[PDB]
Amino acid sequence: AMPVRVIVDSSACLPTHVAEDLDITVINLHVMNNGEERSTSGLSSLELAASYARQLERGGDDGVLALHISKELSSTWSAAVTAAAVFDDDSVRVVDTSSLGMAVGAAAMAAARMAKDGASLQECYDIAVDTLKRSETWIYLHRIDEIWKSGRISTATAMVSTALATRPIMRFNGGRMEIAAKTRTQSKAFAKLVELAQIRADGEPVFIAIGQNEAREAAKQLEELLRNALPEGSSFMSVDIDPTLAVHSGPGAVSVSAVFANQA
Template identity: 35%
Template sequence: MAVVVVTDSSAGLPAELTDELDIAVVPLHVLVGDRTVREGVDPIEIDYTADTVTTSAASPGELREVYERALARSGGDGVVAVHISRQLSGTWEAGRQAARDMASDNVRLVDSLGAGLATGLPTLAAARRARAGAALDIVVDAAVAAASRARTFVLVNRTEQLRRGGRLSTAASFFGSELVTKPLLQIVEGRLELREKVRTRSKAYARLVAAAVEAAGDDGAAVAVQHLGAPEAAETIAGQLRDLAPGIRELIVAEFGPTMGVHLGVGAVGVVVVPGGCA
C-alpha cells in the first residue's frame, strides 16, 4: 500500500488534485446564524459582510474518523495529516488529540504554518512523495520542508473581519483598517501580520506581485494565487507572475473557500510561494 495524506478543507485544493493524489479532506465548519454547515460537503450561501457568520474547527471525533479510514486504506503504512496553522485555527490541536486517542505511531501531524493554499501546497508535496512510494518519515519531511519554505502574502479590503475573528492583532488591525486604504498582510511563523501600508489598490497589487516574485527566485517555485470574488484580479496577477518569474514550475489559481472567505472578505487576493517547488 502507500502512505495516505490528509488535509482540511481550508487548504482550498482543487478537487482534481485531491482526486488525482488520493488526498483525504476533512471539512471545517461555517456557522451561519444558528446553522452549522460543513465546507465542501453541505450547500452554503454566505453573506460575507454579516457579523453572524463565523467558522469553527473540525472536532477530534471527526478528525479521528478520517484518520482511521486513511490508516486502514494505507494498509498500515501510515497517515500524514497537514493542517492549517495552529495559530489560526483549533484544527491542528483537535487533530493531535485525535491521533493521541488512536495511540498509533503511524499517524503524524504537520502544522503547515499557513492557511489556504499555504496549507494546500505542503499537502501536495507530501502526497506526491506518498504516491511515489516514499516511507512515512519521508512524506512527513516533504510536508515540513515545503511548509517551512512557503511565503504567503494577502491583500484585503479591510482587516475588521480578521480582527473580529481574532486572526490579526488589535494593533495591526487598527493600522490596517482605518489608516490604510489597502493593507498587505503576510504570514510569519503561522501568524498573520501586517506587512505594509499601501494607499491604492493598483499599488497594492504591484507590491503583492513584487513580493511574490522576490520570494519565488529562479529555482522552480510552486505558486498559488487565491481570491474571493476577484477572478479577474487573480488571473491578472497570475499572468504577471508568469512574465516576471519565468522559473515558476507550477502555478495554481483558485478561489478561497468559505472558511477562509469569512475572515478575509470579498475582494481578497493572496499569493503563496514555495521556492524550489512541491515535486
C-alpha cells in the same frame, strides 16, 4: 504495503479534482450561518478521530499524514494532536504547519506524490515539512472589515482597524498574521506583492497558487503581473479560497501561495 495516506482540511484550498486525482482526503472546516452573521469553527478531536481511523482502515494502517491549518489561526491542530494520540504510536503523523492555504496544499501534493512511490511516513513527513519551509503566503484584502472581526489580527499588529490601511498585503510569518504593506489601492497592493515575491524568488523559478474569493478578474490581473516579473519557468495554478476562509478574508480577496527554491 499500501501507500501512506494524506489528509488536509478545506483551508488547504486544493481544487476538488486535484484532491480526487491524488487521493488526498479533504475534511471540511465549519461555517455556521445562524441569524445574519457567518462564523466558523475548527475541527473537533472527535471528527478527526473518525476521519483518521477511516483513512487508516483504508490504507491498511501503513500511516496517515495530516496537514491542517496553523495552530495560531485555529483550534484544529490542537484537536488533531488529541485525535492522533488515540492510535498506536506514530500511525498518524500531524504536521505542525504554521500556514494555511495552498502552501499547505502544496506540501500535501508533494507528500501524496511521494506516498504514491511507496515512501515511508517519515519520508512523506520530511517532504511536506521541507515544502512548507520554502513557502510564503501573502493575502490582498480588498476591504478589511472581515479580517478585523476574525480575531486573527493581534493588537500588537493593529490596535484599531485604521492601522491596517484600506487594501493591505498581509503575510503569515511564524504562523501569526502580519502586515506586509499598508497599501490603499489594488494596483499599488498588487505592485507591491509582485515586488516582494520577486525579491524572494531570488532569480529562481517559483511555484505559485493564486487564490481568489469573488475576485476572478483581479486574480487574473495579478497572475499576469507575476508571470512578467517572476523568473522564467515558474508555474501558476488557480484556486478558490475555501469558503471558511472567505468568511474572514471578505469578498475581493486574492491570495498568493508560493513555494521557492530556497529558505527565507
